[model samples]
Target: HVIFKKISRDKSVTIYLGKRDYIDHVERVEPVDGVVLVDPELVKGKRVYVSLTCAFRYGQGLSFRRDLYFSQVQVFPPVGASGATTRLQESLIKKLGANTYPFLLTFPDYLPCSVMLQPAPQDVGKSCGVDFEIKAFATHSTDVEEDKIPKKSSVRLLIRKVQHAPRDMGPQPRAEASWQFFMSDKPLRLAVSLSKEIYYHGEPIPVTVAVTNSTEKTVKKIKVLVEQVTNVVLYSSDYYIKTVAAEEAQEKVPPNSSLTKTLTLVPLLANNRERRGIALDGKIKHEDTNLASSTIIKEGIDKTVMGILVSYQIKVKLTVSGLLGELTSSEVATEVPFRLMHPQP
Candidate 1:
């Protein structure tokens, strides 16, 4: 026969089996039960364990059952028994994501432990079965004076045999795309959008260019340029050049795709001088088979004037000089016109 009791309010206690004890076997004595005694003085404040191991046959040893019991225990005060129960219930619900039977256990002064769902091994010569890895903690009653219950506790038990399930192996997919920039749908065309038609001499102008890739094959390593005609004396007119900004991607273009680039142009002088409006230009590498096979492809200007009804011709040209002569060059062959808004008073 086995007997257990609460010695004091301190909750300090320990119970150990006599030497040469086997949990799985039945010991017969002269009405003298394997007298398991509780040493109140020996109770040290520490982790608690409620272990029980059963011996098995065939030179096999069982694992320590209730392994998680000793570490996760939660002690509590007796006054808030109902609240403690509710807290434990809430903790279990939060942990398991559901509320089921087997009312949760709550000790004084501690939180209820969460259940760990792990796979167990099968029987001998086979895999284990599923089992609950329980969690709990120990706490003490506040009503008990410090001197009554020393700040210490400990417990011991036998081991058992159990199995677990294999680790999880699920699919984890990632996403990716082949993307790039292009001037037109193959035989491409380029479009440009400016935030403002007319700007004050000192103002910054924002320009947006859209290139649509409508062809079956992707255009790669494509470059786009934007220029503004600045100094226009009676004899000479020079344009300032700048590269347009594009999205950073290794792929220059993808089939049947469109990409837009943005840029900010700062005028050299803030003077509100009368001159022709800003001009937009673009080019792509020509696909050919020759010593200078790669050539620059240009887009015709396409815009409408808001104030002036007259259409102005905008010229786009690419001049190849130096050791490599011009392979393909076109002047302002196509023109796009737009009227300027009235000047501010």
Candidate 2:
């Protein structure tokens, strides 16, 4: 239910409801009071005002309950006074009790101003329920009476209803991963120099890994791993040595997307020549298989005995150390090329 009222210019008024009863015979008096202050400066050269009253409760019994009851009063001026009237509502005194609260009476401009009445206790039962008698009171100004003494508009007490929104209790929405891929005109490369040129009793030299995407799609879950010739120990014995960037899942690759990353390797002194070979490898995986296959097969087709064979492959690149791994040292890059090894209907 909604209640309404009106006021006038350059004047202030107040309404007081003596006392009211409550439930459980826990009788008490609830005085509903409202003060309306109008700046003649507000209505300027206009007329008309509308007010609304609402009630609500916070928390349950057992706990310190707060029952808030309020009245939303709005002042409307003539259409011509749109601007001036809006400014007036901004300054209108719409508070009810000692504590003043700013509320939403008029949402958009050209709307009305409003006021609210805090909750007043009458009966005592469940601390949460607000089944108490409430009275409406408002005071404002009047323009009709000329030479006029600004006066408060008297309003009749009215009852109304307020509804609360339902609470949400469900699983959160799932997030989809982004997908991307690309090939480079030239193979990505990098090199690291060791202090002794071999695995000695010292830290292995740090190495950097970089990949340039010439393709339009972003490569997702890019991962780089390394292996040493023979069973040579890596800089970090516990973890696999990785010079390539970590695999990132579901990252958007704009057309021609590219990124660079670095890794460190500390060689331990073991041999005299201070020389050991290593293999640097990288892998690109797609979360969305269908999208990846279509994009990669943009211009390729494998033929078989039956019909044109359909093959799809992801791009991978690798780099390694020289000597024990010379060719790899020249920055050997390869792809785990996919082929329709066999024909399928």
- Top lDDT prediction, candidate number: 1
Off by over 4 Å in 2: 1-202, 231-255, 266-345
TM-score of each: 0.22, 0.17
**lDDT per residue as tens, model 1, 60-135:** 1533222222222222221222232343334433543321111222121111111111111321121111122221
The TM-score leader among the candidates is 1
Error (Å) of candidate 2 at residue 128 is: 83
lDDT of 1 at 8: 27
Residue by residue across 122-231, what tens digits does model 2's lDDT show?
Answer: 32222222222222223334665453323343333432211111122113211112212123343232222212212211223323334454443333443322222111
Model 1 error, position 235 (Å) = 7.7
Off by over 4 Å in 1: 1-187, 221-226, 230-251, 269-345
By summed lDDT, which 10 consecutive residues of candidate 2 come out lowest? 288-297
